[PDB]
């Protein structure tokens, strides 16, 4: 069955039938759509299937279906399940399970470059100092002196759940959030909690606006433990606007490298609870979402205070003006000091380009359109004119639970 | 079954239970979403008119009286006999407030209940409706303190004899193309431009033509009308502090009046059903004068504010955007015609879908049409989980007529 997605401004009209090898649930009924909706142990039995339709994959994109190694592989994978209850990725399928994750991240605009990504192998890995090193390694490889390069650290893979590699950070670089007796937050709102957990666990905190958190790292279902980014490892960028000087004395900065690290890497069944994996930031995360949310950092009215903006009524669009320049100082930051960074507009047109291509050669591209779009100027922008499908393609990222929540303390 | 919805910025968990009574398919699946895509008998009738007069009679909290059950036994008379029913209109007000209730696309619903119904169930003729339709534009209007306002013309009977206004909107303006490729006006209304040249439409030729009306009555062949130029509220627009903005000769009409859709109550199919309310600032500023494929005006206003243009870094295209919807705002509110910023519309939205659930147990809401073309997420209906679903009475898309009709 052959569903087409027509773009409104260009009339392009493209067919998808890699819907068609979708197995995972959306959260959708005939009768409800939740594609607004944020958040809508494994058996022997169900593994050898999963494990199959994986290599099943892997092989065929490598022009080796059916062959004797193929057939061998599939052999070796379902003695070794009986065997020990799970299985070992060769690294070739790792990288290219790793790949395929990205490639599949339906709520990832970014994705024209799924097939350059740095592969750590981190299945070695026995200890929470060694997680630490493992860490510290990637964030240098990935940082690169601002020229940044898109990788993922795998750690070990879930075994019976009792022991999970697990990075408690929502992001490797992230600042602190602290919650005051009066009832403002200091630094970022969003990390309050956590923040709280760090400091409970023994980390002495500074107390100032952007105190780069700790890592909290769980090896092996062990209780997790402390350690502190070396700083000349995270590069920051302070924000300054190319036409207003007094931009500066807000004191803004940011740090050049997103890496998320709370999310679950899927791959022939297994699961790879520490991935954590980072590229390079769209300005508008940080501008739109990160400074202007009103549970973030929310600059907007100090930005419109000092740009003189009438804002005792909303028409005016004081809010959307101030947002704009916001954006402005950001790009212009990272640009000038040459840490890699891509606007929504680039980006997004990037996107289509992308999207056509996986239509062309991969019969489809899942794309989540509320989060594609961009959280600014989403008109002006090509996706918007997009319409898009929506589905589960393996190997994926899940989100999971946070570990403060499951973690059994020894 | 029951299911929860969140408020990221707020924390505030809504429970949805009214998605339980939706009938009709959102065309997603458990293996797909379709969020994103534009359009994804007597043995028929009576359970649909059963649901709906089930409905009404519980609203006017007098369910199961035999007022109730009367009004079931003659209802299913007429269709045994007639094949179709007619509405009260007492249910037909109903009916069409509860349509707009519903209209899971629509941001500005906290006005539901404020709306002013024609009925005009006793047209027989185009003229007919052309009297209809200059007295809604009129009413509408109200010379700027605009009003919401639908009229109902005559429901489907075997669909060889269906009322349609062809027009999208009753006011939009025309769309030419031209020798050197471009196009002139609207692009949008090309199409529509042309089949209106075609049964004898004389075209100013201009950047802003008010179209004629193109009015279906009984299946019959459809005629022209020119809404007269006094009914037709328009804004130049100018900005508070660009004076050069006036230059590149802007103007909008004041009544957004959507007159393609069709309005189903109670299993009864009311083809010509146009309605109007007021602007929300964005969709002028944003969509009519920015989309690539309509007005795009864009590249000349950054060219006007002398910003550069040499990459998309820059901005350019955003800074020019807040401008050129800074001036719609503004000329609309120092002409005294009724417009709503984005900020003002997400808010009261937000109010609106917090009563829903409270009274009503629910809100159909579509995300994707919710949040406004700029500055997404500054406006609080972009952090807000909405659940989608179809409820009936109801407004929905159907053919354009001219595929249709046969001459
Ligand atoms: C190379 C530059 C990249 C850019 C510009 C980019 C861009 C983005 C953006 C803007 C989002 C939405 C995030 C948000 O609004 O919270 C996103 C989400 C996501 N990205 Fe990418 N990305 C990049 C690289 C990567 C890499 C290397 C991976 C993994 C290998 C990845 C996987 C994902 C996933 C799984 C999500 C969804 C996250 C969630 O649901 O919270 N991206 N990306
Ligand atoms: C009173 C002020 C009103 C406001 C501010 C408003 C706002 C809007 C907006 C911004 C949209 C998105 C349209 C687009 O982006 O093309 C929309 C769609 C819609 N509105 Fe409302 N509206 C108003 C009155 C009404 C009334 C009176 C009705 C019906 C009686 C109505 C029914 C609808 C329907 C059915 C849609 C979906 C149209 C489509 O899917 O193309 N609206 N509205
Ligand atoms: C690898 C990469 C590159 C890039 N440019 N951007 C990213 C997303 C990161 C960075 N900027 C935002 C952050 N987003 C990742 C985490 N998102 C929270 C999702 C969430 C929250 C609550 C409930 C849910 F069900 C889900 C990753
Ligand atoms: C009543 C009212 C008030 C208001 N503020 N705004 C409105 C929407 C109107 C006006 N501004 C845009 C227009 N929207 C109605 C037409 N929308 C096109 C939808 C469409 C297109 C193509 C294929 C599809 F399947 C669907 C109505
Ligand atoms: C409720 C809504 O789904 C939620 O706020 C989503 C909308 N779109 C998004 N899009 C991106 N890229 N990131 C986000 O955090 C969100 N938030
Ligand atoms: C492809 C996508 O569904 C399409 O561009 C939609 C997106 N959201 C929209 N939202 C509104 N309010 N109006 C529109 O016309 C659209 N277009
Ligand atoms: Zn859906």
């Not at 890699?18 to 039995?45: A, Y």
């Not at 190694?69 to 379902?78: Q, S």
């Not at 666990?201 to 980014?229: M, S, T």
């Amino acid at each position: 069955r052959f569903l087409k997605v027509k773009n409104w401004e260009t009339d392009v009209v493209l067919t998808d039938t890699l819907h068609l090898k979708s197995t995972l649930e959306t959260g959708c009924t005939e009768h409800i759509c939740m594609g607004s909706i944020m958040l809508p142990v494994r058996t022997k039995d169900q593994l050898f299937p999963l494990a199959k339709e994986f290599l099943d994959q892997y092989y065929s994109s490598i022009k080796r279906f059916g062959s004797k190694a193929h057939m061998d592989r599939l052999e070796e994978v379902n003695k070794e399940i009986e065997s020990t209850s799970t299985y070992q990725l060769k690294d070739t399928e790792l990288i290219y399970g790793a790949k395929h994750a990205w490639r599949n991240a339906s709520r990832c605009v970014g994705r024209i470059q799924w097939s350059k990504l740095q592969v750590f192998d981190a299945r070695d890995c026995t200890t929470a100092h060694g997680m630490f090193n493992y860490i510290c390694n990637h964030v240098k490889y990935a940082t690169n002196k601002g020229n940044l390069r898109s990788a993922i650290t795998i750690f070990p893979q879930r075994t019976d759940g009792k022991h999970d590699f697990r990075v408690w950070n929502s992001q490797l670089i992230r600042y602190a959030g602290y919650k005051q007796p009066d009832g403002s937050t200091l630094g970022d709102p969003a990390n309050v909690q956590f923040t709280e957990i760090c400091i409970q666990q023994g980390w002495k905190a500074p107390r100032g606006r952007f105190d780069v958190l700790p890592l909290l790292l769980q090896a092996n279902g062990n209780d997790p433990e402390l350690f502190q980014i070396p700083p000349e490892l995270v590069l920051e960028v302070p924000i300054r606007h190319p036409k207003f000087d007094w931009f500066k004395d807000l004191g803004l900065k940011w740090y050049g490298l997103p890496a998320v690290s709370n999310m679950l890497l899927e791959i022939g069944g297994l699961e790879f609870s520490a991935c954590p994996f980072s590229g390079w930031y769209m300005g508008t995360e940080i501008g739109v979402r990160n400074y202007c949310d009103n549970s973030r950092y929310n600059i907007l009215e100090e930005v419109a205070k000092k740009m003189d903006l009438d804002m005792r009524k909303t028409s005016s669009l004081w809010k959307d003006q101030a947002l704009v320049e916001i954006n402005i100082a950001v790009l212009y930051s990272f640009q000038s000091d040459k840490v890699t960074i891509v606007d929504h507009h680039s980006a997004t047109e990037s996107f289509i380009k992308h999207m056509e291509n996986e239509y062309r050669c991969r019969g489809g591209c899942p794309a989540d359109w509320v989060w594609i779009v961009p959280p600014m100027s989403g008109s002006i922008t090509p996706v918007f004119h997009q319409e898009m499908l929506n589905y589960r393609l393996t190997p994926s990222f899940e989100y999971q639970p946070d570990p403060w929540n499951t973690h059994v303390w020894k």
